[PDB]
DNA sequence: CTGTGGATAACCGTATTACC
DNA sequence: GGTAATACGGTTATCCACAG
Protein backbone atom coordinates (compact mmCIF):
# COMPACT_ATOMS: atom_id res chain seq x y z
CA UNK A 1 0.00 0.00 0.00
CA UNK A 2 1.00 3.63 -0.42
CA UNK A 3 -0.79 5.72 2.21
CA UNK A 4 -1.41 9.41 1.35
CA UNK A 5 -0.27 10.19 4.89
CA UNK A 6 3.12 8.58 4.24
CA UNK A 7 4.91 6.63 7.01
CA UNK A 8 6.49 3.20 7.26
CA UNK A 9 4.86 -0.16 6.69
CA UNK A 10 6.28 -3.27 8.35
CA UNK A 11 5.25 -6.83 7.40
CA UNK A 12 5.88 -8.18 3.86
CA UNK A 13 4.76 -11.75 4.50
CA UNK A 14 1.44 -10.28 5.63
CA UNK A 15 1.08 -7.87 2.73
CA UNK A 16 1.49 -11.09 0.75
CA UNK A 17 -0.99 -12.95 2.93
CA UNK A 18 -3.52 -10.18 2.31
CA UNK A 19 -2.97 -9.95 -1.48
CA UNK A 20 -3.39 -13.72 -1.50
CA UNK A 21 -6.57 -13.98 0.56
CA UNK A 22 -7.98 -10.53 1.17
CA UNK A 23 -7.10 -10.56 4.87
CA UNK A 24 -3.85 -9.81 6.66
CA UNK A 25 -2.26 -7.72 9.43
CA UNK A 26 0.49 -5.18 8.92
CA UNK A 27 2.22 -2.65 11.19
CA UNK A 28 2.28 1.04 10.37
CA UNK A 29 4.82 3.27 12.08
CA UNK A 30 5.39 7.02 12.08
CA UNK A 31 8.37 8.78 10.50
CA UNK A 32 10.82 10.23 13.02
CA UNK A 33 14.14 12.03 13.10
CA UNK A 34 16.09 12.57 16.30
CA UNK A 35 17.19 16.17 16.84
CA UNK A 36 20.28 17.11 18.83
CA UNK A 37 19.54 20.48 20.46
CA UNK A 38 21.74 23.27 21.95
CA UNK A 39 23.04 22.33 25.36
CA UNK A 40 22.79 18.59 24.86
CA UNK A 41 19.10 17.64 25.01
CA UNK A 42 17.68 15.38 22.27
CA UNK A 43 14.21 15.85 20.73
CA UNK A 44 12.06 13.41 18.72
CA UNK A 45 10.49 14.94 15.59
CA UNK A 46 7.52 13.05 14.16
CA UNK A 47 6.83 13.93 10.51
CA UNK A 48 4.37 11.33 9.19
CA UNK A 49 1.74 9.48 11.29
CA UNK A 50 -0.41 6.41 10.64
CA UNK A 51 -3.26 6.42 8.12
CA UNK A 52 -6.51 7.67 9.63
CA UNK A 53 -4.92 8.74 12.91
CA UNK A 54 -6.24 11.96 14.41
CA UNK A 55 -3.27 14.27 14.86
CA UNK A 56 -4.81 16.33 17.67
CA UNK A 57 -5.87 13.19 19.56
CA UNK A 58 -2.31 11.89 19.16
CA UNK A 59 -0.43 14.98 20.34
CA UNK A 60 -2.86 15.10 23.25
CA UNK A 61 -2.38 11.39 24.08
CA UNK A 62 1.34 12.09 24.26
CA UNK A 63 1.10 15.08 26.56
CA UNK A 64 -1.16 12.67 28.48
CA UNK A 65 1.81 10.31 28.77
CA UNK A 66 3.96 13.18 30.05
CA UNK A 67 1.74 14.51 32.85
CA UNK A 68 1.05 10.94 33.99
CA UNK A 69 4.74 10.04 33.88
CA UNK A 70 3.82 6.74 32.19
CA UNK A 71 7.46 6.97 31.17
CA UNK A 72 10.06 9.61 31.99
CA UNK A 73 11.91 11.68 29.41
CA UNK A 74 9.27 13.92 27.84
CA UNK A 75 10.01 17.54 28.76
CA UNK A 76 7.58 19.15 26.34
CA UNK A 77 5.29 17.97 23.55
CA UNK A 78 4.50 20.56 20.94
CA UNK A 79 2.67 20.48 17.58
CA UNK A 80 4.73 22.62 15.20
CA UNK A 81 2.72 21.74 12.09
CA UNK A 82 1.98 24.48 9.58
CA UNK A 83 1.30 25.53 5.98
CA UNK A 84 4.34 23.76 4.62
CA UNK A 85 4.75 20.74 6.86
CA UNK A 86 3.79 18.32 9.57
CA UNK A 87 6.07 18.58 12.56
CA UNK A 88 5.51 17.31 16.08
CA UNK A 89 8.40 18.15 18.41
CA UNK A 90 8.68 15.92 21.49
CA UNK A 91 11.46 17.62 23.44
CA UNK A 92 13.26 15.56 26.09
CA UNK A 93 14.96 16.38 29.41
CA UNK A 94 18.72 16.27 29.84
CA UNK A 95 19.57 12.65 30.73
CA UNK A 96 16.60 10.65 29.47
CA UNK A 97 16.89 7.46 27.44
CA UNK A 98 15.61 8.61 24.06
CA UNK A 99 15.35 5.06 22.70
CA UNK A 100 13.27 4.13 25.77
CA UNK A 101 10.87 7.03 25.30
CA UNK A 102 10.49 6.33 21.59
CA UNK A 103 9.73 2.62 22.04
CA UNK A 104 7.27 3.23 24.89
CA UNK A 105 5.59 5.71 22.59
CA UNK A 106 5.26 3.25 19.69
CA UNK A 107 3.97 0.58 22.08
CA UNK A 108 1.45 2.59 24.09
CA UNK A 109 0.26 5.34 21.73
CA UNK A 110 -1.02 5.50 18.17
CA UNK A 111 2.37 6.63 16.95
CA UNK A 112 2.35 3.09 15.64
CA UNK A 113 -0.71 0.98 14.93
CA UNK A 114 -1.86 -2.07 12.99
CA UNK A 115 -3.58 -1.96 9.63
CA UNK A 116 -5.78 -4.97 9.00
CA UNK A 117 -6.63 -5.75 5.40
CA UNK A 118 -10.15 -6.99 4.93
CA UNK A 119 -10.86 -6.57 1.26
CA UNK A 120 -14.51 -7.08 0.52
CA UNK A 121 -16.12 -5.64 -2.56
CA UNK A 122 -19.29 -6.15 -4.53
CA UNK A 123 -18.50 -8.47 -7.41
CA UNK A 124 -21.61 -9.53 -9.30
CA UNK A 125 -24.10 -8.12 -6.83
CA UNK A 126 -22.80 -10.21 -3.96
CA UNK A 127 -20.03 -9.37 -1.52
CA UNK A 128 -16.76 -11.25 -2.03
CA UNK A 129 -13.53 -11.29 -0.10
CA UNK A 130 -10.80 -10.82 -2.68
CA UNK A 131 -7.04 -10.72 -2.99
CA UNK A 132 -5.16 -8.56 -5.52
CA UNK A 133 -6.01 -10.98 -8.32
CA UNK A 134 -9.78 -11.05 -8.55
CA UNK A 135 -9.59 -7.29 -8.08
CA UNK A 136 -7.15 -6.75 -10.95
CA UNK A 137 -8.87 -9.32 -13.10
CA UNK A 138 -12.30 -7.78 -12.42
CA UNK A 139 -10.90 -4.43 -13.33
CA UNK A 140 -9.43 -5.69 -16.56
CA UNK A 141 -12.62 -7.34 -17.74
CA UNK A 142 -14.53 -4.22 -16.92
CA UNK A 143 -12.23 -2.24 -19.14
CA UNK B 1 53.88 6.10 23.11
CA UNK B 2 51.03 3.51 23.16
CA UNK B 3 49.08 1.42 25.73
CA UNK B 4 48.08 -2.27 25.36
CA UNK B 5 45.34 -2.21 27.99
CA UNK B 6 43.06 0.15 26.14
CA UNK B 7 43.22 -2.03 23.05
CA UNK B 8 42.38 -5.08 25.17
CA UNK B 9 39.37 -3.21 26.63
CA UNK B 10 38.55 -0.01 24.62
CA UNK B 11 35.07 0.53 25.99
CA UNK B 12 36.46 0.97 29.48
CA UNK B 13 38.49 4.02 28.30
CA UNK B 14 36.36 5.40 25.51
CA UNK B 15 33.05 3.45 25.63
CA UNK B 16 33.00 2.32 21.95
CA UNK B 17 29.36 3.40 21.57
CA UNK B 18 30.44 3.64 17.94
CA UNK B 19 31.01 6.07 16.73
CA UNK B 20 29.83 8.00 19.75
CA UNK B 21 32.90 6.41 21.35
CA UNK B 22 34.97 7.42 18.31
CA UNK B 23 33.97 10.96 19.25
CA UNK B 24 34.76 10.37 22.93
CA UNK B 25 38.40 9.87 21.99
CA UNK B 26 38.53 13.12 20.04
CA UNK B 27 37.14 14.85 23.12
CA UNK B 28 39.94 13.25 25.12
CA UNK B 29 42.89 14.32 22.93
CA UNK B 30 41.62 17.79 22.14
CA UNK B 31 40.72 18.47 25.77
CA UNK B 32 44.24 17.36 26.70
CA UNK B 33 45.63 19.68 24.02
CA UNK B 34 43.55 22.56 25.36
CA UNK B 35 44.67 21.70 28.88
CA UNK B 36 48.30 21.82 27.84
CA UNK B 37 47.77 25.22 26.22
CA UNK B 38 46.08 26.42 29.41
CA UNK B 39 49.31 25.35 31.12
CA UNK B 40 50.75 28.51 29.55
CA UNK B 41 52.30 26.84 26.52
CA UNK B 42 46.72 30.15 23.34
CA UNK B 43 44.98 28.38 20.43
CA UNK B 44 44.12 24.85 19.35
CA UNK B 45 43.51 23.87 15.73
CA UNK B 46 41.40 20.81 15.04
CA UNK B 47 41.46 19.66 11.41
CA UNK B 48 39.35 16.91 9.87
CA UNK B 49 41.47 15.91 6.88
CA UNK B 50 40.20 14.61 3.56
CA UNK B 51 41.78 11.16 3.99
CA UNK B 52 39.62 10.80 7.12
CA UNK B 53 42.25 11.26 9.82
CA UNK B 54 42.18 13.90 12.54
CA UNK B 55 44.94 16.49 13.03
CA UNK B 56 44.96 18.43 16.32
CA UNK B 57 47.76 20.96 16.75
CA UNK B 58 48.78 23.58 19.31
CA UNK B 59 50.83 26.74 18.79
CA UNK B 60 58.57 18.28 27.48
CA UNK B 61 55.03 19.34 26.54
CA UNK B 62 55.00 16.48 24.00
CA UNK B 63 54.36 13.37 26.09
CA UNK B 64 52.91 15.80 28.62
CA UNK B 65 50.41 16.07 25.77
CA UNK B 66 49.64 12.85 23.88
CA UNK B 67 48.82 11.02 27.20
CA UNK B 68 45.09 11.75 27.61
CA UNK B 69 42.22 9.66 29.03
CA UNK B 70 42.15 12.89 30.95
CA UNK B 71 38.89 14.81 31.04
CA UNK B 72 40.76 17.60 32.62
CA UNK B 73 40.02 20.91 30.99
CA UNK B 74 40.15 22.34 34.59
CA UNK B 75 42.30 25.40 33.93
CA UNK B 76 56.40 2.53 28.50
CA UNK B 77 52.69 2.53 27.59
CA UNK B 78 50.14 5.31 28.29
CA UNK B 79 48.11 7.47 25.82
CA UNK B 80 44.85 5.93 24.54
CA UNK B 81 44.64 7.60 21.16
CA UNK B 82 47.88 6.27 19.73
CA UNK B 83 46.78 2.99 21.21
CA UNK B 84 43.40 3.11 19.44
CA UNK B 85 44.52 3.99 15.95
CA UNK B 86 45.79 2.18 12.86
CA UNK B 87 48.11 5.12 12.54
CA UNK B 88 49.26 8.06 14.63
CA UNK B 89 51.85 10.72 13.82
CA UNK B 90 53.46 13.14 16.23
CA UNK B 91 55.32 16.10 14.79
CA UNK B 92 56.97 18.50 17.20
CA UNK B 93 58.65 21.66 16.02
CA UNK B 94 60.30 23.50 18.89
CA UNK B 95 63.74 25.02 18.29
CA UNK B 96 64.62 25.74 14.66
CA UNK B 97 63.87 22.26 13.32
CA UNK B 98 61.06 19.69 13.27
CA UNK B 99 61.21 16.22 14.80
CA UNK B 100 58.61 13.62 13.72
CA UNK B 101 57.54 10.03 14.47
CA UNK B 102 54.72 7.72 13.34
CA UNK B 103 53.08 4.71 14.92
CA UNK B 104 51.06 1.97 13.24
CA UNK B 105 48.28 -0.61 13.76
CA UNK B 106 48.08 -0.15 17.52
CA UNK B 107 50.85 2.00 18.97
CA UNK B 108 53.94 0.21 17.68
CA UNK B 109 56.41 2.78 16.37
CA UNK B 110 57.67 2.39 12.89
CA UNK B 111 60.14 5.29 12.69
CA UNK B 112 62.40 7.06 15.25
CA UNK B 113 61.83 10.61 16.39
CA UNK B 114 64.20 11.99 13.74
CA UNK B 115 64.43 15.43 12.12
CA UNK B 116 62.96 16.39 8.75
CA UNK B 117 63.13 19.97 7.54
CA UNK B 118 64.10 23.03 9.57
CA UNK B 119 61.37 25.38 10.78
CA UNK B 120 62.22 29.09 11.32
CA UNK B 121 58.59 29.73 16.82
CA UNK B 122 57.10 26.40 17.98
CA UNK B 123 54.08 24.10 18.49
CA UNK B 124 53.02 20.45 18.25
CA UNK B 125 50.67 18.48 16.02
CA UNK B 126 49.17 15.02 16.41
CA UNK B 127 47.44 13.52 13.40
CA UNK B 128 45.81 10.07 13.54
CA UNK B 129 43.52 7.65 11.71
CA UNK B 130 41.45 5.39 14.06
CA UNK B 131 40.87 1.81 12.99
CA UNK B 132 37.90 -0.18 11.78
CA UNK B 133 39.27 -3.15 13.67
CA UNK B 134 38.00 -1.77 16.95
CA UNK B 135 35.72 0.94 15.47
CA UNK B 136 32.48 0.63 13.56
CA UNK B 137 32.19 3.93 11.68
CA UNK B 138 35.31 6.07 11.69
CA UNK B 139 33.50 9.04 10.13
CA UNK B 140 34.24 12.22 12.07
CA UNK B 141 30.94 14.11 12.18
CA UNK B 142 31.76 17.81 11.63
CA UNK B 143 28.73 19.22 13.45
CA UNK B 144 29.34 17.22 16.61
CA UNK B 145 33.00 18.27 16.89
CA UNK B 146 31.97 21.84 16.05
CA UNK B 147 29.41 21.78 18.90
CA UNK B 148 31.74 20.38 21.56
CA UNK B 149 34.46 22.86 20.61
CA UNK B 150 31.89 25.62 20.97
CA UNK B 151 30.75 24.78 24.52
CA UNK B 152 34.37 23.96 25.44
CA UNK B 153 35.02 27.56 24.40
CA UNK B 154 32.31 29.05 26.63
CA UNK B 155 33.78 27.22 29.61
CA UNK B 156 37.50 28.10 29.23
CA UNK B 157 38.03 31.77 28.28
CA UNK B 158 41.79 32.25 27.86
CA UNK B 159 41.81 29.74 24.94
CA UNK B 160 40.44 29.77 21.38
CA UNK B 161 39.43 26.74 19.34
CA UNK B 162 39.35 26.38 15.55
CA UNK B 163 37.98 23.55 13.42
CA UNK B 164 38.53 23.23 9.70
CA UNK B 165 37.30 20.34 7.52
CA UNK B 166 39.28 19.49 4.35
CA UNK B 167 36.46 17.12 3.33
CA UNK B 168 34.05 20.01 2.74
CA UNK B 169 36.34 23.09 2.88
CA UNK B 170 34.73 24.79 5.91
CA UNK B 171 35.94 26.17 9.25
CA UNK B 172 34.43 27.70 12.37
CA UNK B 173 36.47 29.37 15.13
CA UNK B 174 35.15 29.79 18.67
CA UNK B 175 36.22 32.46 21.13
CA UNK B 176 33.94 33.76 23.89
CA UNK B 177 34.93 36.69 26.09
CA UNK B 178 31.87 37.36 28.25
CA UNK B 179 31.86 33.66 29.15
CA UNK B 180 29.00 31.78 30.88
CA UNK B 181 26.95 34.95 30.17
CA UNK B 182 27.48 34.33 26.45
CA UNK B 183 26.63 30.63 26.95
CA UNK B 184 23.03 31.16 28.04
CA UNK B 185 22.76 33.80 25.33
CA UNK B 186 23.48 30.95 22.90
CA UNK B 187 20.94 28.74 24.58
CA UNK B 188 18.24 31.32 23.83
CA UNK B 189 19.20 32.66 20.44
CA UNK B 190 16.77 30.37 18.60
CA UNK B 191 13.97 31.46 20.90
CA UNK B 192 12.19 34.65 21.90
CA UNK B 193 13.89 36.32 24.86
CA UNK B 194 12.03 37.93 27.76
CA UNK B 195 14.20 39.13 30.61
CA UNK B 196 17.86 39.97 29.75
CA UNK B 197 20.71 37.69 30.83
CA UNK B 198 21.21 37.41 34.56
CA UNK B 199 24.65 36.62 35.98
CA UNK B 200 26.16 36.03 39.39
CA UNK B 201 29.61 34.67 40.26
CA UNK B 202 30.86 33.45 43.63
CA UNK B 203 33.51 32.00 45.92
CA UNK B 204 33.06 30.34 49.33
CA UNK B 205 34.35 27.45 51.49
CA UNK B 206 36.54 26.28 48.59
CA UNK B 207 33.82 26.53 45.94
CA UNK B 208 33.89 28.98 43.02
CA UNK B 209 30.46 29.16 41.38
CA UNK B 210 29.34 30.97 38.22
CA UNK B 211 25.69 31.02 37.20
CA UNK B 212 23.98 32.82 34.30
CA UNK B 213 20.26 32.66 33.47
CA UNK B 214 17.55 34.20 31.24
CA UNK B 215 13.93 33.72 30.12
CA UNK B 216 12.37 32.72 26.84
CA UNK B 217 8.65 32.63 26.09
CA UNK B 218 8.86 28.84 26.39
CA UNK B 219 7.61 26.06 28.67
CA UNK B 220 10.43 23.58 29.31
CA UNK B 221 13.39 24.95 31.28
CA UNK B 222 16.96 24.31 30.15
CA UNK B 223 19.53 24.05 32.94
CA UNK B 224 23.04 22.70 32.21
CA UNK B 225 25.62 22.17 35.01
CA UNK B 226 29.39 21.71 35.46
CA UNK B 227 31.62 20.49 38.29
CA UNK B 228 35.15 21.33 37.13
CA UNK B 229 34.25 21.98 33.47
CA UNK B 230 32.98 18.44 33.01
CA UNK B 231 29.16 18.45 32.69
CA UNK B 232 26.63 17.10 35.11
CA UNK B 233 24.29 15.27 32.73
CA UNK B 234 21.98 14.46 35.66
CA UNK B 235 22.65 17.37 37.95
CA UNK B 236 22.55 16.99 41.72
CA UNK B 237 23.25 19.05 44.88
CA UNK B 238 24.72 22.15 43.18
CA UNK B 239 21.77 22.29 40.79
CA UNK B 240 19.15 21.62 43.46
CA UNK B 241 20.84 24.33 45.52
CA UNK B 242 20.46 26.81 42.67
CA UNK B 243 16.85 25.71 42.28
CA UNK B 244 16.35 25.98 46.06
CA UNK B 245 17.25 29.67 45.90
CA UNK B 246 15.15 30.86 42.98
CA UNK B 247 11.87 29.59 44.41
CA UNK B 248 12.97 30.67 47.87
CA UNK B 249 13.90 34.25 47.11
CA UNK B 250 10.96 34.71 44.79
CA UNK B 251 8.26 33.50 47.20
CA UNK B 252 9.86 35.89 49.65
CA UNK B 253 9.65 38.66 47.05
CA UNK B 254 6.18 37.36 46.23
CA UNK B 255 4.88 37.87 49.75
CA UNK B 256 6.30 41.42 49.96
CA UNK B 257 5.93 43.18 46.61
CA UNK B 258 3.76 41.01 44.31
CA UNK B 259 1.41 40.45 47.27
CA UNK B 260 0.64 36.73 46.75
CA UNK B 261 3.02 29.63 48.27
CA UNK B 262 3.93 28.62 44.69
CA UNK B 263 5.43 25.38 43.44
CA UNK B 264 8.96 24.25 42.66
CA UNK B 265 8.83 25.10 38.96
CA UNK B 266 6.38 27.91 38.04
CA UNK B 267 9.36 30.25 38.40
CA UNK B 268 11.36 28.23 35.93
CA UNK B 269 8.86 28.21 33.05
CA UNK B 270 11.12 29.02 30.10
CA UNK B 271 14.16 29.59 32.28
CA UNK B 272 17.46 28.61 30.68
CA UNK B 273 20.47 28.72 32.97
CA UNK B 274 24.15 27.76 32.82
CA UNK B 275 25.69 26.45 36.05
CA UNK B 276 29.45 25.94 36.36
CA UNK B 277 31.13 25.50 39.73
CA UNK B 278 34.55 24.53 41.00
CA UNK B 279 34.70 22.05 43.89
CA UNK B 280 38.00 21.21 45.68
CA UNK B 281 39.12 17.53 45.86
CA UNK B 282 38.31 17.39 49.56
CA UNK B 283 34.62 18.21 48.94
CA UNK B 284 34.04 16.40 45.67
CA UNK B 285 31.80 13.32 45.72
CA UNK B 286 29.59 11.88 42.90
CA UNK B 287 27.23 8.87 42.66
CA UNK B 288 27.49 5.16 41.82
CA UNK B 289 30.19 5.45 39.12
CA UNK B 290 30.08 8.08 36.32
CA UNK B 291 30.44 11.76 37.23
CA UNK B 292 26.92 12.29 35.82
CA UNK B 293 25.43 13.34 39.21
CA UNK B 294 27.00 15.54 41.94
CA UNK B 295 26.70 14.16 45.47
CA UNK B 296 28.76 16.63 47.56
CA UNK B 297 26.28 17.69 50.26
CA UNK B 298 28.25 20.91 50.94
CA UNK B 299 27.61 22.12 47.40
CA UNK B 300 23.84 22.30 47.93
CA UNK B 301 24.17 25.12 50.48
CA UNK B 302 27.24 26.91 49.04
CA UNK B 303 25.50 27.23 45.67
CA UNK B 304 22.20 28.08 47.45
CA UNK B 305 24.14 30.58 49.55
CA UNK B 306 25.96 32.37 46.78
CA UNK B 307 23.02 32.49 44.34
CA UNK B 308 20.34 33.33 46.96
CA UNK B 309 22.41 36.25 48.22
CA UNK B 310 23.18 37.80 44.83
CA UNK B 311 19.64 37.12 43.60
CA UNK B 312 18.14 38.83 46.66
CA UNK B 313 20.11 42.02 45.94
CA UNK B 314 19.81 42.08 42.13
CA UNK B 315 16.07 41.53 42.70
CA UNK B 316 16.11 45.11 43.94
CA UNK B 317 17.59 46.10 40.58
CA UNK B 318 14.32 46.68 38.78
CA UNK B 319 10.76 45.88 39.79
CA UNK B 320 9.29 46.27 36.35
CA UNK B 321 10.70 42.87 35.41
CA UNK B 322 10.49 41.46 38.96
CA UNK B 323 6.79 41.88 39.71
CA UNK B 324 6.32 40.71 36.13
CA UNK B 325 8.15 37.43 36.57
CA UNK B 326 6.30 36.95 39.89
CA UNK B 327 3.15 37.67 37.89
CA UNK B 328 3.96 35.12 35.20
CA UNK B 329 4.71 32.63 37.99
CA UNK B 330 1.35 33.11 39.70
CA UNK B 331 -0.02 32.61 36.18
CA UNK B 332 1.91 29.34 35.77
CA UNK B 333 0.58 27.86 39.02
CA UNK B 334 -2.96 28.57 37.85
CA UNK B 335 -2.38 27.08 34.42
CA UNK B 336 -0.52 24.08 35.94
CA UNK B 337 -3.28 23.03 38.35
CA UNK B 338 -5.82 23.63 35.60
CA UNK B 339 -4.38 20.40 34.19
CA UNK B 340 -4.47 18.60 37.56
CA UNK B 341 -8.15 19.48 37.98
CA UNK B 342 -8.98 18.52 34.40
CA UNK B 343 -7.09 15.24 34.86
CA UNK B 344 -9.04 14.18 37.98
CA UNK B 345 -12.28 14.27 36.01
CA UNK B 346 -10.84 11.88 33.41
CA UNK B 347 -12.34 25.64 26.08
CA UNK B 348 -13.09 25.99 22.41
CA UNK B 349 -9.88 28.04 22.60
CA UNK B 350 -7.03 27.10 20.27
CA UNK B 351 -4.22 28.47 22.40
CA UNK B 352 -0.93 30.01 21.26
CA UNK B 353 2.17 27.87 21.85
CA UNK B 354 4.30 30.42 23.67
CA UNK B 355 2.92 32.31 26.64
CA UNK B 356 3.83 36.01 26.37
CA UNK B 357 1.27 38.76 27.14
CA UNK B 358 3.49 41.31 25.38
CA UNK B 359 3.11 39.86 21.86
CA UNK B 360 0.20 37.39 21.73
CA UNK B 361 -3.00 38.08 19.85
CA UNK B 362 -6.45 36.68 20.69
C1' DC C 1 -13.96 1.47 25.79
C1' DT C 2 -12.58 4.19 21.34
C1' DG C 3 -12.75 5.23 16.22
C1' DT C 4 -13.78 4.18 11.39
C1' DG C 5 -17.79 6.09 7.54
C1' DG C 6 -22.27 6.05 5.44
C1' DA C 7 -27.10 5.89 7.32
C1' DT C 8 -31.37 7.04 11.05
C1' DA C 9 -33.43 11.00 14.17
C1' DA C 10 -33.70 15.06 16.88
C1' DC C 11 -31.80 19.37 19.45
C1' DC C 12 -31.20 25.20 21.11
C1' DG C 13 -28.46 29.34 22.14
C1' DT C 14 -28.21 34.68 20.23
C1' DA C 15 -30.37 39.67 17.64
C1' DT C 16 -34.29 42.72 16.32
C1' DT C 17 -39.64 45.59 17.92
C1' DA C 18 -43.60 45.18 20.62
C1' DC C 19 -46.96 44.35 24.26
C1' DC C 20 -49.19 42.73 28.22
C1' DG D 1 -42.09 35.56 31.52
C1' DG D 2 -43.98 34.78 26.21
C1' DT D 3 -44.05 34.71 20.80
C1' DA D 4 -43.98 36.59 16.54
C1' DA D 5 -40.24 35.60 11.50
C1' DT D 6 -35.87 35.87 9.01
C1' DA D 7 -31.20 35.83 10.20
C1' DC D 8 -26.14 34.27 12.95
C1' DG D 9 -23.99 30.03 15.28
C1' DG D 10 -23.39 24.99 16.85
C1' DT D 11 -24.65 19.65 19.02
C1' DT D 12 -26.16 14.35 20.31
C1' DA D 13 -27.70 9.45 20.21
C1' DT D 14 -28.52 5.33 17.60
C1' DC D 15 -26.78 0.77 13.80
C1' DC D 16 -23.08 -1.89 11.50
C1' DA D 17 -17.75 -4.88 12.00
C1' DC D 18 -13.60 -5.32 13.88
C1' DA D 19 -9.62 -3.97 16.19
C1' DG D 20 -6.51 -3.37 20.51
MG1 LIG E 1 0.66 1.14 18.97
MG1 LIG F 1 -8.61 2.23 17.37
TrEMBL record, chain B:
Top enzyme class: isomerase
GO molecular function: ATP binding; DNA binding; DNA negative supercoiling activity; metal ion binding
Keywords, sorted A to Z: ATP-binding, DNA-binding, Isomerase, Magnesium, Metal-binding, Nucleotide-binding, Topoisomerase
Gene: parE
One GO location term (cellular component): chromosome
Reaction(s) the record says it catalyses: ATP-dependent breakage, passage and rejoining of double-stranded DNA
Domain of life: Bacteria
Assembly and binders: Heterotetramer composed of ParC and ParE.
Role noted for this protein: Topoisomerase IV is essential for chromosome segregation. It relaxes supercoiled DNA. Performs the decatenation events required during the replication of a circular DNA molecule.
EC number: 5.6.2.2
Official protein name in the record: DNA topoisomerase 4 subunit B
Biased composition (Basic and acidic residues): 338-346
Species this protein is from: Streptococcus pneumoniae
Keyword Lyase belongs to the record: no
UniProt cofactor(s): Mg(2+)
One record GO biological process: DNA topological change
